[PDB]
């Protein structure tokens, strides 16, 4: 195999991982995020859900991740919350904060389906890459991480496809989920600086 096929080092977030599984805690956390951002700021977005199917559709969203800086990421374990946090809902529906990710449009649906929350102002990293990189490629979060960072995303299938609704989350689940939203934040940031 070519050099381009070599196994690269794993992208691993090493900043602060804030784990929340209580509604009001999550809403106040959402306000902290809003107090630390200005209109236009972008955050890495992503979510997880259990394996088993539910009445003909993917298991209901159990975790939502938001990476707000290069040193901090939030894990909102909604599957363990009595009600969906109002401050998070408002945060996610606030067009003042952009959410970056890959396959994000699909997250919007399902988000609407599972929680009746309308994700507002989301950016599909694939479109941003093709724009700033002056190309027309079919990106994945992994291929973007490889191309721009020289790393690959953690890939233990048993972790990535684990029971995300199982409480509490394991340190591995927390690292995987956190890093995925982190990639989203770093990829957007780097792509945006280009000109
Ligand atoms: Mg995902
Ligand atoms: Mg993920």
Q: What is the DSSP string of 137-182?
A: ----HHHHHHHHHS-EE---HHHHTS-TTSSSPPHHHHHHHHHHHH
User: How far is residue 46's CA from residue 56's CA, in Å, rounded to a whole number?
Assistant: 22
CATH number, domain at 65? 3.30.420.10
The CA 189 to ligand 1 mean position distance, Å, reads: 19
| CB burial of residue 189 (10 Å; 0-12, 13-18, 19+) | middle
Q: Which residues contact 194 (CB under 8 A, 6 or more apart)?
A: 132, 133
Backbone angles phi, psi at 65, to 5 degrees: -110, 140
In the numeric block, the tokens 């804030």 are attached to 18
Range(s) of the domain holding residue 23? 1-195
Measured N-to-C along each axis, helices 125-132 and 171-193 cross at an angle, to the nearest 10 degrees, of: 30
Ligand with an atom nearest the CA of residue 176: 2
The dihedral built from the CA positions of residue 111, 63, 30 and 80, taken in this order, carries a sign that is: positive
For ion ligand 2, residues whose CB falls within 5 Å: 46, 180
**Cis peptide bond N-terminal to 195, omega within 30:** no
How far the first Cα of the chain sits from its last, in Å, is 34
The CA 122 to ligand 1 mean position distance, Å, reads: 14
Could you give the number of structural domains in the chain?
1
Tokens of 80: 């363990």
Q: Which of 24, 15, 30 is nearest to 88 (CA)?
A: 30
User: How far is residue 29's CA from residue 90's CA, in Å, rounded to a whole number?
Assistant: 12
In the numeric block, the tokens 């102002």 are attached to 121
Q: Are 96 and 120 in contact (CB under 8 A)?
A: no
The CA 142 to ligand 2 mean position distance, Å, reads: 11
Q: Which residues contact 110 (CB under 8 A, 6 or more apart)?
A: 58, 61
What was the resolution (in A) of this experimentally determined structure?
2.2
Method used to determine the 3D structure: X-ray
User: How far is residue 150's CA from residue 137's CA, in Å, rounded to a whole number?
Assistant: 18
């Amino acid at each position: 195999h070519s050099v381009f096929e070599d196994d690269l080092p794993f992208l691993e977030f090493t900043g602060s991982i804030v784990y929340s599984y209580d509604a009001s805690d999550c809403s106040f956390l959402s306000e902290d995020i809003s107090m630390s951002l200005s209109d236009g700021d972008v955050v890495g977005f992503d979510m997880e859900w259990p394996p088993l199917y539910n009445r003909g559709k993917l298991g209901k969203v159990a975790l939502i991740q938001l990476c707000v800086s290069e040193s901090k990421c939030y894990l909102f374990h909604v599957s363990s919350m009595s009600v969906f946090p109002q401050g998070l809902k408002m945060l996610l529906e606030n067009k003042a904060v952009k959410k970056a990710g890959v396959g994000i449009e699909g997250d919007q649906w399902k988000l609407l389906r599972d929680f009746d929350i309308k994700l507002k102002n989301f950016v599909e990293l694939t479109d941003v890459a093709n724009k700033k990189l002056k190309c027309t490629e079919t990106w994945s979060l992994n291929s973007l991480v490889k191309h721009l960072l020289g790393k690959q995303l953690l890939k233990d299938k048993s972790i990535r496809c684990s029971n995300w609704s199982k409480f509490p989350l394991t340190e591995d689940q927390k690292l995987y989920a956190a890093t995925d939203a982190y990639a989203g934040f770093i990829i957007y940031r780097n792509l945006e600086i280009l000109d």
